[PDB]
Amino acid sequence: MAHSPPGHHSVTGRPSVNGLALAEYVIYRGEQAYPEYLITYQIMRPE
Amino acid sequence: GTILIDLSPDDKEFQSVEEEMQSTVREHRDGGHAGGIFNRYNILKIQKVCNKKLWERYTHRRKEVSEENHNHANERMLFHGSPFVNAIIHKGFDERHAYIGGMFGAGIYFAENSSKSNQYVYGIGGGTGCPVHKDRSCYICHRQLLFCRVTLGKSFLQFSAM
Ligand SMILES: CCc1cc2c(N)cccc2c(=O)[nH]1
Ligand SMILES: [Zn+2]
């Protein structure tokens, strides 16, 4: 695993180009996340 | 040490987690190549993941970060998709779940858009799709995502051509 940028605990990937996209985030220590919900699902075919 | 508790669809917690799943679907620039073509999900089950060891591991690190950032963990709830969600819920996140080829280097990646995490359920770029039908847009096969509590602390802002 890589390291966080010095003086930071994560990275935020802010969408430039695509106006409708939300952010993505990266952590570099597994202890910085807890898997709180497991969601089981199907994708739905548009009508 | 993990146990999974089923939430009832009548439970406010089930409903708020479903709304976050459904309301953060978007269209993707790949036209559905990786994740499939859809506007919404059929939620089949939501389970609470309960593991004392892993929770304590998380809260210990969260306090370290908080103390390095004026008592602010900058905690978010974010989605994570991976073929290894079964290992994650039993053993936690670690270096094996790092995306070596990611845009922001070899870390563990999370998304606000549930449909972004959905692109990774069957592997990088959707892999070869579901195991049964080899279809990245399978409407039959059950998929799984994690909705995760994530400590960001002080986060480095990368403006990104996404
Ligand atoms: C490597 C699996 C993965 C990658 C990913 C990403 N690159 C951006 C936002 C979310 C995810 C995700 O959920 N899983
Ligand atoms: Zn299938």
Which are the residues after which chain A is interrupted (C to N > 2.5 Å)? Answer: none
Query: Which site among A3, A4, A37, A42 would you substitute to test the B interface, given the most B Cβ atoms closer than 10 Å to its Cβ?
Result: A37
Task: Report whether B138 belongs to an annotated binding site.
Answer: yes
Task: Report whether B130 belongs to an annotated binding site.
Answer: yes
Per CATH, which fold does B1-162 belong to?
Phosphoenolpyruvate Carboxykinase; domain 3 (3.90.228)
d(CA A1, CA A5): 13
Q: How was this structure determined?
A: X-ray
The ligand that comes nearest to the alpha carbon of residue B112 is 1
Residues 6+ apart with CB under 8 A from B23: none
Q: Which residues pair with B146 in a beta bridge?
A: A38, B80
Residues 6+ apart with CB under 8 A from B72: B66, B153
Q: What is the DSSP letter of A45?
A: -
With beta carbons under 8 A apart, name residues in chain B contacting A47.
none
Report the DSSP pairing between strands B41-50 and B3-6: antiparallel
Atom 14 (ligand 1) nearest CA? B81
Report B:22-51 residues touching A (Cβ under 8 A).
24, 26-27, 29, 35-49
d(CA B47, CA B34): 25
Q: How many domains does chain A have?
A: 1
> Which CATH number is A40's domain given?
6.20.320.10
Do A26 and B109 make contact, defined as CB atoms within 8 angstroms?
A: yes
Nearest to B159 by CA among A27, A18, A20, A1: A18
What is the residue range of A32's domain?
Answer: 1-47
Segments of B27-103 assigned E as strands: 41-50, 75-80
Is-contact B110 B24, C-beta < 8 A? no
* Residue B6 to chain A, least CA–CA distance (Å): 9
Task: Report whether B141 belongs to an annotated binding site.
Answer: yes
